[PDB]
Amino acid sequence: PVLSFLYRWIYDGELEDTYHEFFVASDPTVKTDRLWHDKYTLRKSMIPSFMTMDQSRKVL
Amino acid sequence: LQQSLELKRKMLRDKQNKKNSGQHLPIFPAWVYERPALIGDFTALPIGTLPLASQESAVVEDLLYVLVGVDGRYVSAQPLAGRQSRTFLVDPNLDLSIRELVHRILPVAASYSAVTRFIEEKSSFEYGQVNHALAAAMRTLVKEHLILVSQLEQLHRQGLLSLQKLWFYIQPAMRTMDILASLATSVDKGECLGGSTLSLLHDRSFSYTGDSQAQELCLYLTKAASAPYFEVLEKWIYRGIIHDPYSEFMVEEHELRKERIQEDYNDKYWDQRYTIVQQQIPSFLQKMADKILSTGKYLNVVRECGHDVTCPVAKEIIYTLKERAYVEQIEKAFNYASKVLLDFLMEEKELVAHLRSIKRYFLMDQGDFFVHFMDLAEEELRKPVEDITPPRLEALLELALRMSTANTDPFKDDLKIDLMPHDLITQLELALSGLEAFSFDYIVKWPLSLIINRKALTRYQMLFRHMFYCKHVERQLCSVWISNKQWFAGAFTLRQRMLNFVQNIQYYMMFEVMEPTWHILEKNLKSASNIDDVLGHHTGFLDTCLKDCMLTNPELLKVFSKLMSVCVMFTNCMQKFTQSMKLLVSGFEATINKFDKNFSAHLLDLLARLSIYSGMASVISRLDFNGFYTERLERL
């Protein structure tokens, strides 16, 4: 599941969850021009130990 | 038994602090100790009062239960529930002839239960890498022991066995259990783990050379145990990244990534960042150890910058008895390492031009550049120290460079004018500079800081500063020559001799030192099979070029400094006396003759102090090529 969340986020760059399972902290609002800085933020508790901080940061 | 529980936790702790990406390491659950999940191996009548034809059937059936490590019926397993020791008690009143034979069967039993306990105690999550492989490889022999016990099990089911058959049966198996129990005792006793029980497994295989029943046993467990180790090895070898997410390997990577990044000030790659560790050497890879280290050390600095490198081919290698699959792959791996690094560097981040643009200025290949720059910078240069300002000297450099036809090399703005802060003490005043100093900082680039060192650059500066005295005295002698296009005819001879001397000194450095060993270096850096030869060739070029020239002498030649001092004193005096006569013939000769005497002293001392030394004797032969001032003082 977490690798399929990664490969849905390399392809289309959009994913759907209602439970915290991935290293992205999504904000549901669509914003106006603030969209870039704030809809996607780095959640660190869902980073695997076979991935590093660089991998999550770059794919985000 | 008790000693293991300590080690296991501490081996965990080393790897939580070394990895900053280690996450949620386990605790061993308490129930595995409170309730049995490790060890599973932990009415009674006197046999002597029984009839005979019940005693035989009963003692055979009970001892068969007793062997596994737990109580039978009339033979009991004495409680220890631990270490390599176990004793069994048959009833003392058994008939003497049968009981002495029952006592003889017991050594396979005490060397079975012990053999089981090593597989039960050391199934824990932590211990060394070889011991975890060895548990899974020793259990295979427990299974092959069972297939003989399975035949025995069927036979005992069919209402038949006797003690003489059993005694004849267990004679082959006793030795194999003896070898396994001795191995378990030695591995637990010495507190050896990791790679230090890859030494013990290597030594025990050599030790047996009289039967080779146990030699092959140690060989089988070592060939099984070296199969994960060589895959971790091939991960480190074919690409610089370790694709194993533990560090068990003989190479470890220090984290000096937070000291040197986008600059090198230690040369961390070639010192000890990728180092080897003694207690993870298996003691059959010790012959290959330096090669193994140097291989992947070369791979990192190509796999980092963006060049796709992978395995060209990989093949399995195994520890085999006094024979090597490993050597043939280590050598090919080594040549592949050095070839991809050396090819990638000699095309992108060109070493060729970096060495050429050092030969062009410090060893001096363009003279037009310096005859422009020295002339247009000397009036700032002549002043005492801190009266110079480096923006101005840098700006006039950008002149004399861009006027001169030296515009054909990529690295020419890397030259920045700095000074030696402690000027003559760097060689092996502080109020004068630009009369005894002229130095640059040529900046060295990211992989060219590992092939040209800091020490290399300061030696280049010291050789350039040694040539600065000749560069100074040469052009001062030309400018005093144009004054005479009164005087003294011997003053013209003194002038002629001094300029002849300095011109010969530099020409000898030209066609003797820099150009020939540069011609050797353009062969050596392309005929190397490792980069520890390439470093050696660069260090050897600099070492030769310093040893042949006058930078290394037994006595260091203070007369060289005194000689160039009286050369400067002569040109100052002659310019002053010529302009304050026409613009005598006796006092002029009086000052010029004293400079003649001082110079002849300092020259003859030089020829004698160079003749004791030593090829590089060509310096003495060319100065006395005439047979004038041909060394009239004897020493030695």
Which residues does chain B have within 8 Å of residue A55's beta carbon, measured at their own beta carbons?
A: none
Scanning the structure block, which residue is given the tokens 């030969």?
B359
Of chain B, the end-to-end C-alpha distance in Å amounts to 77
User: Is-contact B321 B204, C-beta < 8 A?
Assistant: no
B29–chain A nearest CA distance, Å: 21
Using CA atoms, how far apart are residues A60 and A39, in angstroms rounded to an integer?
A: 11
CB spacing of B24 vs A52 below 8 angstroms: no
Cα separation, B587 vs B352, in Å, equals: 57
Cβ-based contacts of A47 with chain B (< 8 Å)? 23
Residue B343: CB atoms within 10 A of its CB come to 12
Helices (H) and strands (E) in chain B, counts: 21, 8
CA–CA distances in Å: residue B468 to residues B436, B439, B455, B502: 8, 9, 20, 11
Q: Cα angle vertex B623, ends B622, B627, to 5°?
A: 100
Token pair 């610089």 in the structure block, residue: B240
Residues B478 and B446: beta-carbon distance below 8 Å: no
Which residues in chain A are contacts of B15 at CB distance < 8 A?
none
Cβ atoms of B583 and B481 within 8 Å: the answer is no
Q: Please judge whether B24 and A53 are an interchain contact, meaning their C-beta atoms are less than 8 angstroms apart.
A: no
B21 touches chain A (CB under 8 A): yes
Residue with tokens 């070889």: B130
Under 8 Å between Cβ of A24 and A60: yes
**Is B122 in contact with B131 (CB distance < 8 Å)?**
yes
The coordinates were experimentally obtained by cryo-EM
- State the Rg of chain B over Cα: 41
Residues in chain A: 60
**DSSP readout, B24-78?**
-PPPPPTHHHHTTSS--------GGGS-HHHHHHHHHHHHHHHTTSS--SSEEEP
On whether any CB of chain B is under 8 Å from the CB of A50, the answer is yes
B377-385: list long-range contacts, CB under 8 Å, 24+ apart. B380/B434, B381/B434, B381/B435, B381/B438, B382/B434, B382/B435, B383/B434, B384/B431, B384/B432, B384/B433, B385/B419, B385/B430, B385/B431, B385/B432, B385/B433, B385/B434
B392-410 burial, b for 16+ CB within 10 Å, e for fewer?
ebeebbeebbeebebeeee
Are the beta carbons of B23 and A47 separated by less than 8 Å? yes
Contacts of residue B21 in chain A, CB cutoff 8 Å? Answer: 49, 52-53
Q: Which of A47, A50, A53 sits opposite B245 (nearest CB)?
A: A50
Three-class secondary structure of residue B356 per DSSP: helix
| Interface mutation vs chain B, best among A45, A49, A54, most B CBs within 10 Å | A49
d(CA B338, CA B298): 6
Alpha-carbon dihedral angle through residues B287, B288, B290, B296, given to the nearest 10 degrees? -170
User: For residue B441, which phi and psi values (nearest 5 degrees)?
Assistant: -110, 105
Taking the Cβ of residue B255 and every Cβ of chain A, the question of whether any pair is shorter than 8 Å is answered with no
Q: How many CB atoms lie within 10 A of CB B55?
A: 17
B195 neighbors B130 (Cβ within 8 angstroms):
yes
Contact status, residue B567 vs residue B480, Cβ threshold 8 Å: no
Cβ–Cβ gap B23/A53 under 8 Å: no
Alpha-carbon gap: A2 to the closest alpha carbon of chain B (Å): 16
Asked if B50 and B58 touch (Cβ cutoff 8 Å), the reply is yes
Residue B21 to chain A, least CA–CA distance (Å): 6
Inter-residue contact B551 to B462 (CB < 8 Å): yes
Q: How many CB atoms lie under 10 A from the CB of residue B587?
A: 9
Closest C-alpha to B607, from B581, B579, B632: B632
Tokens of B593: 């003759």
* Cβ <8 Å between B24 and A49: yes
Q: Are B338 and B301 in contact (CB under 8 A)?
A: no
Which residues of chain B are within 8 Å of residue A52 when distances are taken between CB atoms?
21
Report the distance separating Cα B517 and Cα B549, nearest Å: 13
What letter represents residue A1's amino acid? P
Dmax (CA) of chain B:
147
Closest CA to B149 of B177, B119, B184, B117: B177
Residue B440's beta-bridge partner residues?
A: B417
Are A53 and B21 in contact (CB < 8 Å)?
yes
B626: helix, coil or strand?
Answer: coil
Interface contacts A/B by beta carbons within 8 Å: 10
CB contact under 8 A, B23 and A49: yes
Rounded to whole angstroms, the Cα distance separating B234 from B230 reads 6
* Amino acid at position B611, single letter: S
Give me the amino acid identity at A38.
Answer: D
Residues of chain B with Cβ-Cβ distance to A53 below 8 Å are 21
Separation between Cα atoms, residue B619 and residue B610, nearest integer Å: 8
CB B420 within 8 A of CB B437: yes
Distances (CA, A) of B577 to B474, B476, B570, B573, B584: 20, 15, 10, 6, 8
Pull the structure tokens for residue B365: 């290949």
Which residues in A lie closer than 8 A to residue B23 (C-beta atoms)? 47-49
Q: Which of B296, B42, B11 is nearest to B128 (CA)?
A: B11
Segments in B127-275 forming alpha helices (H): 129-157, 163-189, 200-207, 215-238, 268
The C-alpha atoms of residue B243 and residue A54 are separated, in whole angstroms, by 16
Name the minimum distance, in Å, from the CA of A31 to any CA of chain B: 34
Distance of CA A17 to the CA centre of its chain: 10
Angle, helices B163-189/B129-157, rounded to nearest 10 degrees: 170
Residue B89's DSSP bridge partners are: B76
Three-class secondary structure of residue B203 per DSSP: helix
DSSP B367: H
For A47, the closest chain B residue by CA position comes to B23
Q: With an 8 Å Cβ cutoff, is B245 touching chain A? A: yes
Other beta carbons within 10 angstroms of residue B358's beta carbon come to 21
Give DSSP secondary structure letters for B401-445. HHHSS--SSS-SSSEEEE--TTGGGG----S--SSS--EEEEPP-
CA-nearest of B7, B61, B66, B12 to B41 is B66
Residue B614: CB atoms within 10 Å: 10
Q: Which of B23, B24, B241 is the mutation pick for testing A, counting most A CBs within 10 A?
A: B23
A54 in contact with B at a CB cutoff of 8 Å?
no
Each residue of B246-270: b (16+ CB within 10 Å) or e?
ebbbbbbbeeeeeeeeeebeeebbb
The residues that bridge with B415 in the sheet, in sequence order, are B442
Resolution (A): 8.7
CA–CA dist B139, B342 (Å, integer)? 48
B187 class by beta-carbon count within 10 Å (0-12 exposed, 13-18 middle, 19+ buried): buried
Q: Kindly report the backbone phi and psi dihedral angles of residue A24, in degrees, each rounded to the nearest multiple of 5, phi listed first.
A: -110, 135
Rounded CA-CA distance A46/A22 in Å is 5
Report the C-alpha gap between B247 and B19 in whole angstroms: 10
Contacts with A46 from chain B: Cβ below 8 Å? none
A36 shares contact with chain B (CB less than 8 Å): no
CA distance B515 to B413: 24
How would you class B315 by CB atoms within 10 Å of its CB: exposed for 0-12, middle for 13-18, buried for 19 or more?
A: exposed
Q: Minimal Cα–Cα distance from B347 to chain A, Å?
A: 30
Tell me if chain A has a CB within 8 Å of the CB of B43. Answer: no
Tell if the CB–CB gap between B245 and A47 is shorter than 8 Å. Answer: no
